[PDB]
Amino acid sequence: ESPAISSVMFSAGVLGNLIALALLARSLFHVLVTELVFTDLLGTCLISPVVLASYARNQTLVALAPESRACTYFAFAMTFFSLATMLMLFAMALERYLSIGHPYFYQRRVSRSGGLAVLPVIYAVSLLFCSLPLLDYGQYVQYCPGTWCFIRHGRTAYLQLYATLLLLLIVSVLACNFSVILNLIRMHRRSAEETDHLILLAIMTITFAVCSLPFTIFAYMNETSSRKEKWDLQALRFLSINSIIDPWVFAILRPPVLRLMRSVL
Amino acid sequence: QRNEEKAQREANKKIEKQLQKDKQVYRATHRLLLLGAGESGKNTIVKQMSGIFETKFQVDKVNFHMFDVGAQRDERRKWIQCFNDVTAIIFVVASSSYNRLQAALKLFDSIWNNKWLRDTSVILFLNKQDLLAEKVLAGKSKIEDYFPEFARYTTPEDATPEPGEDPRVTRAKYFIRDEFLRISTASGDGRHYCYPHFTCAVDTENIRRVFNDCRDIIQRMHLRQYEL
Amino acid sequence: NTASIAQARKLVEQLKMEANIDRIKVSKAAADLMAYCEAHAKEDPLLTPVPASENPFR
Amino acid sequence: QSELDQLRQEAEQLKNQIRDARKACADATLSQITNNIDPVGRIQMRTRRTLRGHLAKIYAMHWGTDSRLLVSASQDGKLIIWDSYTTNKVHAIPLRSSWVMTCAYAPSGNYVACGGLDNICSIYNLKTREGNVRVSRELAGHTGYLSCCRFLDDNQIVTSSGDTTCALWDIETGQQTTTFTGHTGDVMSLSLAPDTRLFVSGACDASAKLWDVREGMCRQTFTGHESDINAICFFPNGNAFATGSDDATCRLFDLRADQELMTYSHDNIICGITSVSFSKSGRLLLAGYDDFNCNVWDALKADRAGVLAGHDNRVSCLGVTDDGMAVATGSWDSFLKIWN
Amino acid sequence: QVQLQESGGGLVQPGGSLRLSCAASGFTFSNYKMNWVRQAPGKGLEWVSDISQSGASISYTGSVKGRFTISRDNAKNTLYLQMNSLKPEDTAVYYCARCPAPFTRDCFDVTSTTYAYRGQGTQVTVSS
Ligand SMILES: O=C(O)COc1cccc(CN(Cc2ccc(-n3cccn3)cc2)S(=O)(=O)c2cccnc2)c1
């Protein structure tokens, strides 16, 4: 049990987020991507030290080394950052869909000033829906790797509601992205750069549907089935990989950079 | 002492409360610059759709204000800079009456390549198609008498014409459209697009054309925000 | 060219009316400008920055 | 037919005579007797204030004679009167036409003028009897767009128009008292002298003219530039003035020498000048440009000694305060800045 | 002063050849794009030909394309228009116009009947 996979992907993720923040911290979309990379970096830097702590403070002997309320906070912040990133992605997809799908309506009703308020309402909803179990409405348990905790399968009805909320957000993001792709194809047919945007959105949608559905796929099964095949770990690793991929393809692979990479060839 | 300053602050607060209501109205309207070539039927097109005249119309609950300069001189390199933030310049060209077609081409070339109008888009209305058809069938005046490259010009493949017109009228119309699209296509210096259309006096669906072209303009405007 | 003859007469009239004027030498005019710029050299808050105590835009 | 060529030959003979007279009166260059005075060093102006509230590009701006209040005209249709010390908006007047191109503040602080593509100059009263700000007058009678206007007092106003003529109006009556003709292009700017006797006007014919207000005739013509003239401003003492044009060059002309004295240009400057102004002493010459910046020139040494770079779009207007304490600049990015 | 003086006009039998010249003074000739325009008896000003700052970009109108050829010599600040195979419909007053601003690629008002950067024009008459 060595950090051959965990620490390396954590380092890659924080390095990509810092690279993105370098070219970013110097429009509404601009406000949204700042907040997205901010919450991504916050979540990863506040979670990963806790999962690294159970590598030197225990030789696969005692999963709860620091205290009795450690992995509880781990699972809480895990669900919190997951819902936060998913709601941020939903907000960005809805903004883009409105921007390309309904231009006139977007031209008036939507302004950059109201963009800072998105983080405050999403954090509020996520704190509510993730401290919900802390008020005895749910309960956390530890898993086969031992270095993390999450919601228990059965004995309550919280994991199914969490998974269905995640699935609703995912299908909404996918619907918005497919509608924007359809509109871009339509505007390319009616007529360079629309092909660039099509390629970017295809990449983003594929990496979002690959790295975020397995959680819902595995959360609707028995706990005995997953641990036998060790799927519960990959279910969350894929969400973390999605949180890594988001800022990279949002800020570093912008249409200018894709145009440069295509001109080089 | 401080009462005067707080009265000033209250006056400023009321001024800003009014400026917000004015800002919400300034963003809902779309300004267009109707800049015809003269003797081109732009008066009939504003019939359809003293220093400057203004016409308001509404399509799908979207408001458009179209401005036509009136009592100005024929030198226009100084007052045209006022219209660099307008969403579209509607350029009307008398396709049949002309050398006014070369004058229109030179005016479009000056607008397209201007330093301040380099990110403004042009909706090109080639008016007077009925007279053009009747003059191409009647053979009274040829474009080869003013555009020697009209011969050897083959009509392109796409854009099937309506059945009632002679194919030579199609050739003339598309030759003029290509004369404008060569200028539109070639410079590449600034961002903006041209939308050529065929109109007439009997036509009645020009407001929806302007609506769709401005929708496309605003879509491409929003699209740029994502890159860089 | 019946509208041009009157315009040309007006132009030549203005030319010969503005040709008979007084002209001092460039040396004295430049000296007057230099003397004016030297007399008010201390009365220019932009030419010499005023401290933050008398600057109302501080 | 032939008499027209006779008149043209007479005109060219007079032009040659005037040019030879000018060359006779030119004995020593300004850049020669100024080679000893010490340079101003370097000017470092910083953005003290930034006034926000305009929706579109700002074309005009004008300080008040109390050196505190400011006016600005935007192409959204707003005439905003700011207090610059506290950054508070004192007034916000909505205009009938959105295409305003000029604005002026009366030397008494009671009226404000504005005009534009509607060929009309509207005068607004700022001190009505416990009421709103309303159109006091509407001076009509010009044929082209109104490009500049300046108050002589609360009753007289001089306006430049795009129909190649200037006009002096009596506001009370409402009709033109005097008309100044002679330009062959759009008159772009005008500048009042320290005294209210004379004023200079620049046009698109690459020439400037000096007009007497009381008589109504043109005194002198200056033809140093080679493109359209956009800006004009009097030297603080009224014996000289400075112009800027599209040929990317500012120039200094003298009234009594009747010729140009200095040329402010640089190799990497290939954009036109939109506005020029003089400081209180007359030693510095500020000029706004199309490349989004403002340059400060040593009016006597002709070397540039400072830059003003805070605007994101073309600098449209620029004005130094009557006490010489601040420089307001307005740009097409819809922001007014104060530099000190 | 910006001065443009044209020369070379005259009466020529149909089919002959002419060469109009345009001497410029008061501006940097090599920074402006130059134009030849003309006015026919009883008509308005129309654009004939134009050439850019260097001489690489050249354009003619449909009526003269193939017959006329425009050139500029920057060494002596001169513009030339060589007219070949003239016809009776070429009789007009020819003007040498300068583009209003330097370094630009667009010239707005060269045919405005009041343009200030034009010349006085030479009468080119084609008859027998
Ligand atoms: O010991 C072992 O093998 C088991 O360790 C485990 C067990 C379960 C799940 C994980 C994944 N991680 C936890 C995590 C999840 C989501 C976010 N986040 C989401 C949005 C914003 N932030 C941040 C951190 S992670 O490895 O630390 C990581 C991966 C990639 C990038 N940053 C950190 C690891």
mmCIF file of C-alpha atoms and ligand atoms in Angstrom, chain A residues 6 9-10 13 39-40 43-44 47-48 51 55 74 78 81-82 85 145 147-148 233 236-237 239-241 243-244, ligand 1:
data_model
loop_
_atom_site.group_PDB
_atom_site.id
_atom_site.type_symbol
_atom_site.label_atom_id
_atom_site.label_comp_id
_atom_site.label_asym_id
_atom_site.label_seq_id
_atom_site.Cartn_x
_atom_site.Cartn_y
_atom_site.Cartn_z
ATOM 1 C CA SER A 6 -2.856 8.948 -5.082
ATOM 2 C CA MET A 9 -2.432 12.458 -9.286
ATOM 3 C CA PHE A 10 -2.822 14.933 -6.424
ATOM 4 C CA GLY A 13 -3.920 18.170 -10.183
ATOM 5 C CA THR A 39 -13.006 25.704 -5.335
ATOM 6 C CA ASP A 40 -11.092 22.880 -7.041
ATOM 7 C CA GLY A 43 -11.046 21.101 -2.075
ATOM 8 C CA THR A 44 -7.950 19.209 -3.159
ATOM 9 C CA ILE A 47 -8.703 16.872 1.422
ATOM 10 C CA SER A 48 -5.489 15.217 0.238
ATOM 11 C CA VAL A 51 -5.646 10.910 3.072
ATOM 12 C CA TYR A 55 0.376 6.476 5.429
ATOM 13 C CA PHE A 74 -13.132 13.584 5.517
ATOM 14 C CA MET A 78 -15.656 14.965 0.250
ATOM 15 C CA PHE A 81 -16.494 19.502 -2.629
ATOM 16 C CA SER A 82 -18.147 16.984 -4.961
ATOM 17 C CA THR A 85 -17.759 21.158 -8.303
ATOM 18 C CA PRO A 145 -8.766 0.935 1.621
ATOM 19 C CA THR A 147 -7.779 5.704 4.222
ATOM 20 C CA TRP A 148 -11.203 7.294 3.626
ATOM 21 C CA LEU A 233 -12.293 3.392 -4.709
ATOM 22 C CA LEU A 236 -14.354 8.457 -6.264
ATOM 23 C CA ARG A 237 -11.003 8.487 -7.983
ATOM 24 C CA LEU A 239 -14.678 12.172 -9.721
ATOM 25 C CA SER A 240 -11.323 13.469 -8.499
ATOM 26 C CA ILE A 241 -9.905 12.956 -12.008
ATOM 27 C CA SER A 243 -11.978 17.755 -10.912
ATOM 28 C CA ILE A 244 -8.390 17.616 -12.209
HETATM 29 O O1 LIG F 1 -5.092 5.996 -0.247
HETATM 30 C C1 LIG F 1 -5.799 5.748 -1.259
HETATM 31 O O2 LIG F 1 -5.306 5.123 -2.234
HETATM 32 C C2 LIG F 1 -7.254 6.210 -1.304
HETATM 33 O O3 LIG F 1 -7.294 7.607 -1.292
HETATM 34 C C3 LIG F 1 -8.442 8.151 -1.876
HETATM 35 C C4 LIG F 1 -9.818 7.582 -1.548
HETATM 36 C C5 LIG F 1 -10.896 8.098 -2.100
HETATM 37 C C6 LIG F 1 -10.768 9.270 -3.069
HETATM 38 C C7 LIG F 1 -9.579 9.761 -3.348
HETATM 39 C C8 LIG F 1 -9.435 10.929 -4.316
HETATM 40 N N1 LIG F 1 -8.857 12.053 -3.606
HETATM 41 C C9 LIG F 1 -9.662 12.784 -2.649
HETATM 42 C C10 LIG F 1 -10.287 14.009 -3.315
HETATM 43 C C11 LIG F 1 -11.617 13.883 -4.052
HETATM 44 C C12 LIG F 1 -12.157 14.938 -4.624
HETATM 45 C C13 LIG F 1 -11.454 16.290 -4.547
HETATM 46 N N2 LIG F 1 -12.048 17.452 -5.179
HETATM 47 C C14 LIG F 1 -13.167 17.338 -5.920
HETATM 48 C C15 LIG F 1 -13.460 18.609 -6.367
HETATM 49 C C16 LIG F 1 -12.374 19.437 -5.788
HETATM 50 N N3 LIG F 1 -11.496 18.670 -5.039
HETATM 51 C C17 LIG F 1 -10.308 16.401 -3.912
HETATM 52 C C18 LIG F 1 -9.683 15.176 -3.249
HETATM 53 S S1 LIG F 1 -7.213 12.442 -3.834
HETATM 54 O O4 LIG F 1 -6.401 11.243 -4.059
HETATM 55 O O5 LIG F 1 -6.609 12.987 -2.616
HETATM 56 C C19 LIG F 1 -7.064 13.597 -5.220
HETATM 57 C C20 LIG F 1 -7.162 13.143 -6.507
HETATM 58 C C21 LIG F 1 -7.052 14.026 -7.531
HETATM 59 C C22 LIG F 1 -6.842 15.353 -7.266
HETATM 60 N N4 LIG F 1 -6.737 15.848 -6.034
HETATM 61 C C23 LIG F 1 -6.850 14.963 -5.027
HETATM 62 C C24 LIG F 1 -8.332 9.160 -2.710
#
